[PDB]
Design an enzyme around this catalytic site. Sequence first.
Site, PDB file in Angstrom:
ATOM      1  N   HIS A  40      41.345  56.059  33.885  1.00 40.40           N
ATOM      2  CA  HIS A  40      40.830  56.354  35.224  1.00 40.40           C
ATOM      3  C   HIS A  40      40.057  55.169  35.794  1.00 40.40           C
ATOM      4  O   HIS A  40      39.716  55.173  36.992  1.00 40.40           O
ATOM      5  CB  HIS A  40      40.047  57.643  35.272  1.00 40.40           C
ATOM      6  CG  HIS A  40      38.633  57.535  34.914  1.00 40.40           C
ATOM      7  ND1 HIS A  40      38.161  57.848  33.675  1.00 40.40           N
ATOM      8  CD2 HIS A  40      37.551  57.204  35.665  1.00 40.40           C
ATOM      9  CE1 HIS A  40      36.839  57.687  33.678  1.00 40.40           C
ATOM     10  NE2 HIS A  40      36.463  57.311  34.876  1.00 40.40           N
ATOM     11  N   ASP A  84      43.108  59.842  28.587  1.00 41.98           N
ATOM     12  CA  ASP A  84      42.337  58.917  29.425  1.00 41.98           C
ATOM     13  C   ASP A  84      41.990  57.642  28.658  1.00 41.98           C
ATOM     14  O   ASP A  84      40.831  57.381  28.261  1.00 41.98           O
ATOM     15  CB  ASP A  84      41.132  59.600  30.059  1.00 41.98           C
ATOM     16  CG  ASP A  84      40.435  58.730  31.098  1.00 41.98           C
ATOM     17  OD1 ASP A  84      41.016  57.724  31.532  1.00 41.98           O
ATOM     18  OD2 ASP A  84      39.253  59.001  31.382  1.00 41.98           O
ATOM     19  N   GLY A 175      29.894  54.708  36.211  1.00 37.37           N
ATOM     20  CA  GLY A 175      29.656  53.295  35.935  1.00 37.37           C
ATOM     21  C   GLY A 175      29.715  52.988  34.431  1.00 37.37           C
ATOM     22  O   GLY A 175      29.891  51.816  34.043  1.00 37.37           O
ATOM     23  N   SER A 177      31.874  54.731  32.616  1.00 38.53           N
ATOM     24  CA  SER A 177      33.245  55.093  32.387  1.00 38.53           C
ATOM     25  C   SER A 177      34.034  53.958  31.724  1.00 38.53           C
ATOM     26  O   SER A 177      33.913  52.808  32.147  1.00 38.53           O
ATOM     27  CB  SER A 177      33.907  55.427  33.664  1.00 38.53           C
ATOM     28  OG  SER A 177      33.349  56.618  34.218  1.00 38.53           O
ATOM     29  N   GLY A 178      34.858  54.298  30.737  1.00 39.13           N
ATOM     30  CA  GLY A 178      35.673  53.330  30.008  1.00 39.13           C
ATOM     31  C   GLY A 178      34.992  52.710  28.794  1.00 39.13           C
ATOM     32  O   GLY A 178      35.648  52.048  27.968  1.00 39.13           O
TER      33      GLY A 178
END
Length: 223
Positions: A40, A84, A175, A177-178
């Site tokens: 995402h 994801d 922020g 995320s990942g």
Amino acid sequence: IVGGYTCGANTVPYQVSLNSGYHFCGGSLINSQWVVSAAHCYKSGIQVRLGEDNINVVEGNEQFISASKSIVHPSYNSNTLNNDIMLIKLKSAASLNSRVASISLPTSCASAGTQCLISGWGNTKSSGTSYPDVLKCLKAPILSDSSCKSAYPGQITSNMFCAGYLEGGKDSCQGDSGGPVVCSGKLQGIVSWGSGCAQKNKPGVYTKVCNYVSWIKQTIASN
Ligand SMILES: [Ca+2]
């Protein structure tokens, strides 16, 4: 990261920032040419920033390397966020050193109750917005599958786990995320989703990396 602590410069040496003119997501360095992040977080024109503490100051230990290729999981579903996960190949190998290092992939999935380290430059407020300049950290336990499914009825797959604190106050956030969830020295999670941040009964949801080690190894072997 809400309710966390300043990690300390370069003490999370596998943490990267993805930059497209600004920081927009985290990632984890898994070898000198490859980063794991969330699907995402896909965008075109990614620059990988390694060796960062303060993302708005050049402090002297950074390596900035453009992405040569992005590979979103073949079965990534942006509606449910199932699968994801994404790989990002660097145009050039990173120079591995004390401050820029890879993180091991898991061989077995993590135990429920394991305290893990989550990190990133995301929002530090549970209501309102404040983005830090320096890297933030949080120690958070993996929650039981049952409590995770109870929290998000109908929405948790076998490729996701919950981690955090049901009482609220401590969580990853936009922020982050990942970015990595590291347990017992292994990359076990990726910061994926959640209902708000650090809210009561709404823990963080993370991509379960141990389900993907075969795809990661095969993809890196062929690209
Ligand atoms: Ca910097």
